[PDB]
């Protein structure tokens, strides 16, 4: 049985997510953004950490792969209004596609069952990467579905060095989010659950 709190994290990591192409800025003010989605929806989007803020601007075209932080609502013309949070990279698209090499393991195991994530986008949000991975997660190993899966981490190592990395017992922090990365320079993921 799980207390509230990892309840609430698999209510988050198994809700979905909104991927929209080619959307175009409408406005964009200190850490929120007005987008017009290509099937007539506009997206008001916020961006809480100092270390990222998009800088694109009317008219420019952009790439959405994000989560509404509360419902979808009708403006009294009958425009549909979606409420999201970061998620926002630029159009450029990668050759062909390409299989990040996630490495999972369970309570000290090699998880033998492998899955890839598949993306054809240069560059996605940190974010995005983190409701990717925690979603097969859940999905596959079952994390947060019972009291012996609920914490460990996930950790992205670049072909530099650099690296990035979350606790599975926390939700993503969001206030503090560094700026997208490429993928084609992501050179290990892997995830351990506790």
Known sequence: STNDNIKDLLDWYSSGSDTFTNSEVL?????????????????????????????????????????????????????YIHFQISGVTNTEKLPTPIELPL??????????????????????????????????LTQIHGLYRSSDKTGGYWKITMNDGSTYQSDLSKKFEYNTEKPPINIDEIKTIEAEIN
């Open 103 to 136: 490495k999972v393991k369970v309570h000290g195991k090699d998880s033998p069952l492998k899955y890839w994530p598949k993306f054809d986008k240069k560059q996605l949000a940190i974010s995005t990467l983190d409701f990717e991975i925690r979603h097969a």
């Open 27 to 79: 406005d964009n003010s200190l850490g929120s953004m007005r987008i017009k989605n290509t099937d007539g929806s506009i997206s008001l989007i916020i961006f809480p950490s100092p270390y990222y803020s998009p800088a694109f601007t009317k008219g420019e075209k952009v790439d959405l792969n994000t989560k509404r932080t509360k419902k979808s609502q009708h403006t009294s013309e009958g425009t």
